[PDB]
């Protein structure tokens, strides 16, 4: 029958979970041969001026940075970006896995390994006129249910020898100098899709967020691969933010976002500089190269002590709060690992700097005495210089292997970055009483971008829901 009351259906936006390719938006000049510019020209969408955000009201959503697929998607883009951008002079990657040749093609003699001897023995030559078709070999660490080593026939263009098989696959290709300048990259959801952005000043990357907005695109992010220190990332709106899925678990890393950035300045590679020196007036010996100085491999990373010291103090206080007040907070150098793990490795200009973070991570904060000592040392000093080295052969972060690149031509510039976060790994374990020890960590590049995408969630939009008056 209806009533005098008029019911108006409210076009309430409805949001549903979806995963799709995020379209990278960036402002870059096609003419430039720069790595990021050429990539943008190859595949990007223009960044819209003043996009703004649409704020959703009375909407609360549970966010999970770790679960957020966008991170994986971006990481894949990062991997592709680097692989095309930088071509090694020599690429080393293992080919074949745990394959050991015990018999060579065209052998009629069965050869067998003997464990007790530690040597190969001629098991027996075949009476019948049969010659081995393919390379016969055993697979290390592979045991059948029968308790037998798995044996895999190998067909190669060239016959491998007994006791061999499994090469380093040397790949040799051009490695010309290519300019690498990180350019912020926005990510925009495809039409019919939106990005939900948590607007909380302090959010740990997980849990319900009441303050949520719809954004077409993410904020611009520089694809910087860095170990130990998060470079040129987002700065905390409020106090230092420490994020971990499980603080209690020592294996889980702690990602620390800083309220203020810390300046890290390294120097070395740049464009070639041309100089001519006549020498000896010319006749008798003319125009060459003199003044070779030291080793270009050497570099210095300058970080202001006071700025770093305050940063450490803030982080330590936050850590102690999170864990609870009672355990000590200690910053210690890495236990070890590959150079990339051991030192703050990061790429500038297409070359990786390995900077020794030991000086950065050598402090105890539990006692006033320590605090006084640090203060006094700071007062005497000004900046901390970290020894940095550029290794032309670099361990590949994407996959297990080695990549080789050309040495720097000249110097004269400064490679600068903002330490916007710290990656901390806690030793933990039963025995570590009265103390908690944090060491710089890395190798899982995803983490670098997880911190960036923690607040971003990609959502599908379907036809608007209609809400009757109730």
């Amino acid at each position, epitope marked *: 029958t209806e009533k005098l009351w008029v019911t108006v259906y409210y076009g309430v936006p409805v949001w549903k979970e979806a995963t799709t390719t995020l379209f990278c938006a960036s402002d870059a000049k096609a003419y430039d041969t720069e790595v990021h510019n050429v990539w943008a020209t190859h595949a990007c969408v223009p960044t819209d001026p003043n996009p703004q955000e649409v704020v959703l009201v009375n909407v609360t959503e549970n966010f999970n940075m770790w679960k957020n697929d966008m991170v994986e998607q971006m990481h894949e883009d990062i991997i592709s970006l680097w692989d095309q951008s930088l071509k090694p002079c020599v690429k080393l990657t293992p080919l074949c896995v745990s394959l050991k040749c015990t018999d060579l093609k065209n052998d009629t003699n069965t050869n067998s390994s003997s464990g007790r001897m530690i040597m190969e023995k001629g098991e027996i030559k075949n009476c019948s006129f049969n010659i081995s078709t393919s390379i016969r070999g055993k697979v290390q660490k592979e045991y059948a249910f029968f308790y037998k080593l798995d044996i895999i026939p190998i067909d190669n263009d060239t016959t491998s020898y007994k006791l061999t098989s499994c090469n380093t696959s040397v790949i040799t290709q051009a490695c010309p100098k290519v300019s690498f300048e990180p350019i912020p990259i926005h990510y925009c959801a495809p039409a019919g899709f939106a990005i939900l952005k948590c607007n909380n000043k302090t959010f740990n990357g997980t849990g319900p967020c009441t303050n949520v907005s719809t954004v077409q695109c993410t904020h611009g992010i520089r694809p910087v691969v860095s170990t130990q220190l998060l470079l040129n990332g987002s700065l905390a709106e409020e106090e230092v933010v420490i994020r971990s899925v499980n603080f209690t678990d020592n294996a889980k890393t702690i990602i620390v976002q800083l309220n203020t950035s810390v300046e890290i300045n390294c120097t070395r590679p740049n464009n070639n500089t041309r100089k001519r020196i006549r020498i*000896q007036r010319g006749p008798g*010996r003319a125009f060459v190269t003199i003044g070779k100085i030291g080793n270009m491999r050497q570099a210095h990373c300058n970080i202001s002590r006071a700025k770093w010291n305050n940063t450490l103090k803030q982080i330590a206080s936050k850590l102690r709060e999170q864990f609870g007040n009672n355990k000590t907070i200690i910053f210690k150098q890495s236990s070890g690992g590959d150079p990339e793990i051991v030192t703050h490795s990061f790429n500038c200009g297409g070359e990786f700097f390995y900077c020794n973070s030991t000086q950065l991570f050598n402090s105890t904060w539990f006692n006033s005495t320590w605090s006084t000592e640090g203060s006094n040392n700071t007062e005497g000093s000004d900046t901390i210089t970290l020894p940095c080295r550029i290794k032309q052969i670099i361990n590949m972060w994407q996959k297990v292997g080695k990549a080789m690149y050309a040495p720097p031509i000249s110097g004269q510039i400064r490679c600068s970055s903002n330490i916007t976060g710290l990656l901390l790994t806690r030793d933990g374990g039963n025995s570590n009483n009265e103390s908690e020890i944090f060491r710089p960590g890395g190798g899982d590049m995803r983490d670098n971008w997880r911190s960036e995408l923690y607040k971003y969630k990609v959502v599908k939009i379907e036809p608007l829901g209609v809400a009757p008056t109730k």
Partner: antibody
Amino acid sequence: EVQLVQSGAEVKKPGATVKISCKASGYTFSDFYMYWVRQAPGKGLEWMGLIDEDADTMYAEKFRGRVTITADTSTDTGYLELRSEDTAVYYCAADPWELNNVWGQGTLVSVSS
Amino acid sequence: DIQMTQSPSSVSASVGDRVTITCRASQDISTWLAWYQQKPGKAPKLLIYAASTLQSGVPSRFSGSGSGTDFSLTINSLQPEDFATYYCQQANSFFTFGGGTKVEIKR
């Protein structure tokens, strides 16, 4: 002062392993580049390669990848690697003054049946 | 790689003769060259490092010159002790040697 000492003459059969070592003295081995050069009898000098502090090495096209040059900084020593077709005299060079100067006395490697 | 060629392969000369041996780089090496003298039974000796910089103990009569892809070493007055073999080396990155020039006594 600065002396480079190369290992004694080495005689090997074809395809046999020959490793020749040069030990540095009188300068900080780690801080300076070591160079390897081979000269065949009746033939000119052929530069094999150089080694840097970080173990990063350069090689000539002929020797590219096939030869690995390794240096033991702890003993201030360098090592080479070649074959019978390259049977010859091998020189280890160093550059303490950054002038591409000092050479070693040389090692004779004879590889024959 | 880069071809380093020096010529003539051998030069016949008398004592007191002025001898020019030319080293040519197939590609522009700019200023990165070195000159070495070698004698029978002897390791290479550095006459010139950086084709313009004199090594102490080298007589003035040795005269370097040239640039880019073309360099030449001129012996102003050739002497019995000078007679020998000569090599030109690229110094920019790959220390490649030239074919070699032998200066021998003309009779």
